[PDB]
Amino acid sequence: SKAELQSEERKRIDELIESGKEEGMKIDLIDGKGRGVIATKQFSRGDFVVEYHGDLIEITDAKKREALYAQDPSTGCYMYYFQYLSKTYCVDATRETNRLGRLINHSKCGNCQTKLHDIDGVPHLILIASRDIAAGEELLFDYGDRSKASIEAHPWLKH
């Protein structure tokens, strides 16, 4: 039944969010990208891959932080914006951690899709396999920034 399956699916995902378990992945160096994350096991279409884990903040704090980050070229670009219940939030993963979602590179034709996953009105950004993923693949998803200012500075956004 759609009901029992929706329940089972929620329990798998929530279990994984909470454990912060990030099995099946490793960091590699990728020519022209810096670090990236390689799958070490197969993932099936629809599987939880990893959370995009960082600091969950609202719009005012996000703006404050960007202004600060821009004053430093070495910072890098780890803020992930979304809409939730008519408000803008951001998962800011700028701080170096051992979490892997923040190291995944961009492709418009990647193998992960980001989903908003509500746990009791607290939003989480999760990456789900958009297709079966072979061990050895680079994990990739669409960063989603299509703006002229960004694609000019960072031309790999076009691909």
Partner: peptide, 7 residues
């Protein structure tokens, strides 16, 4: 010049 990520 920075880029972002957007859902």
């Amino acid at each position: 010049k920075r880029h972002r990520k957007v859902l």
